[PDB]
Design a protein around this ligand. Structure first.
Ligand SMILES: CCCCC/C=C\C/C=C/CCCCCCCC(=O)O[C@@H](COC(=O)CCC/C=C/C/C=C/C/C=C\C/C=C/CCCCC)COP(=O)(O)OC[C@H](O)COP(=O)(O)OC[C@H](COC(=O)CCCCCCCCCCCCCCCCCCC)OC(=O)CCCCCCCCCCCCCCC
Length: 208
């Protein structure tokens, strides 16, 4: 059970983010995934909730009326729970692109490892149950997910999902939902990330 990769994910990728609201005594804390430069990945249902007035990430406070550049991923016309957010100028994130994406799909009942900063830092684990085209949720249908056998809790959203295929372990999801001891995470592809970063203007050298 080598977790050198997952520890690297915990060290460089997963961070706490807290949404501050004028509706409730405390901020809603979850996880975010630093991608590169000034962009990170976040759950759509958290980002789009109209209540928050600021959020904190990597020691910075950002208000809602700031001009974020964002990409909301869809699949065959159905929304996914995945959002990409680029902040204004500031201290750069690590370049974590090498940690995302698998070219082969994980073998059924291989091990999924979640990497979370939602309650302090922790890992969770469960076996891969396969991809699903959609889930039916309390906030509607969401597209392009995969499921894993493990009981998950409110706040674990945004945790990185590390799967294995072809001898390699990579992040291919972030946690979205739970239902009766089975969690669901929204799928992340390297090609989607690359094209979203280009749309957002996140400067990257292209390997020729
Ligand atoms: C074993 C054999 C394998 C099997 C084969 C598999 C399949 C075979 C074929 C099958 C049938 C064919 C069918 C196709 C399947 C193919 C396989 C496949 O999967 O292909 C997929 C293609 O995607 C991929 O490439 C993945 C990648 C996967 C594969 C792709 C194919 C390959 C392609 C290329 C191949 C190789 C190339 C390799 C390259 C190497 C790398 C490249 C290096 C270079 C198909 O998926 P689809 O086409 O369906 O979607 C496209 C994309 O995924 C998402 O779209 P996106 O652009 O990113 O979204 C646009 C927009 C962004 O948001 C905003 O910007 C507005 C927000 C704007 C606000 C902010 C922006 C403005 C800024 C403000 C201020 C900014 C300040 C500065 C500004 C300056 C500039 C500003 C910006 C420019 O989002 C919205 O929509 C609005 C969002 C709303 C839509 C949602 C609806 C409801 C929303 C809410 C949730 C629910 C709540 C309900 C309330 C309503």
């Amino acid at each position: 059970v080598d977790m050198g990769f997952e520890a690297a994910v915990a060290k460089k990728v997963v961070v706490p983010i807290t949404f501050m609201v004028p509706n409730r005594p405390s901020g809603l804390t979850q996880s975010a995934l630093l991608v590169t430069g000034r962009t990170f990945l976040i759950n759509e249902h958290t980002w789009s909730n109209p209540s928050w007035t600021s959020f904190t990430i990597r020691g910075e406070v950002h208000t809602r009326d700031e001009p974020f550049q964002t990409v909301h991923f869809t699949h065959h016309g159905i929304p996914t729970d995945l959002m990409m957010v680029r902040l204004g100028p500031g201290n750069s994130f690590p370049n974590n692109l090498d940690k995302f994406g698998l070219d082969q799909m994980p073998a059924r009942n291989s091990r999924v490892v979640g990497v979370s900063s939602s309650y302090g830092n922790f890992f969770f684990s469960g076996n891969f149950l396969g991809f699903v085209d959609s889930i039916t949720s309390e906030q509607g249908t969401y597209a392009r997910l995969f499921r894993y056998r493990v009981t998950t809790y409110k706040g674990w959203c945004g945790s990185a999902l590390v799967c294995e295929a072809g001898g390699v372990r990579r992040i291919i999801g972030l946690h979205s939902a739970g239902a009766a001891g089975i969690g669901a995470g929204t799928y992340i592809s390297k090609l989607g990330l690359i094209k979203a970063l280009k749309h957002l203007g996140e400067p990257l050298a292209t390997m020729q």
